[PDB]
């Protein structure tokens with residue numbers, strides 16, 4: 001069983017650091033901000049051996065029929081914002097609507113950088129936003145690995161739930 005997962009959200013929220021934490025179990029400080037790449041990881045989730053294909057998005061903001069079709073291949077999306085960056089949180093509506101445009105799509109709201117003291121987005125605002133979308137909210141830190149497996153595995157569970165419909 002394979003799951004095509006896509007990680008989306010504003011520049012600098014930690015999409016690459018979250019992806020590398022899942023794949024390598026290490027925190028990366030300076031992953032090239034412009035690079036969009038995909039990685040595979042074999043995991044066992046709820047007893048089921050799964051191949052996660054994770055697309056870590058990046059690059060210029062462009063919309064082409066080609067990019068729409070590429071995004072449409074994703075089966076589940078992590079909507080990542082950073083808890084110390086209000087604009088990244090405000091941009092979540094944009095990412096969710098782009099996914100719905102190109103595709104009931106499995107998604108998880110991820111509030112990353114949970115280790116920082118400089119919070120600007122409170123937990124309740126994010127919980128409320130996730131509730132309005134009918135999706136889970138997971139707090140993470142790519143630095144300490146808090147919530148990292150939970151965010152990806154919850155996304156896989158959401159895909160499984162969608163496939164049952």
Ligand SMILES: *[C@H](C(=O)N1[C@@H]2CC[C@H]1CN(c1nc(OC[C@@]34CCCN3C[C@H](F)C4)nc3c(F)c(-c4cc(O)cc5ccc(F)c(C#C)c45)ncc13)C2)[C@@](C)(CC)C(=O)O
Nearest residue numbers: 008010011033034058059061063064067068071094098099
């Ligand atoms: C920054 C960088 O890597 N990125 C910037 C933010 C994330 C990536 C790709 N970029 C991008 N940006 C937006 O919206 C940004 C913003 C803020 C400025 C004005 N914009 C409109 C809103 F206000 C939010 N959206 C993007 C996309 F929607 C997509 C994309 C494109 C298509 O065709 C379909 C699609 C379907 C589902 C999706 F989830 C997405 C996504 C994502 C889709 N593509 C990119 C995108 C800009 C960088 C590191 C540049 C390398 C930097 O600035 O230095």
Ligand SMILES: Nc1nc2c(ncn2[C@@H]2O[C@H](COP(=O)(O)OP(=O)(O)O)[C@@H](O)[C@H]2O)c(=O)[nH]1
Nearest residue numbers: 011012013014015016017028029113141142143
């Ligand atoms: N403290 C802290 N820093 C993070 C975390 N995630 C990413 N970073 C840092 O934030 C910056 C941007 O992260 P990156 O993964 O490149 O963001 P991306 O543009 O969304 O791919 C880098 O300096 C990362 O080391 C986190 O959870 N906590």
Ligand SMILES: [Mg+2]
Nearest residue numbers: 015016033058
């Ligand atoms: Mg990146």
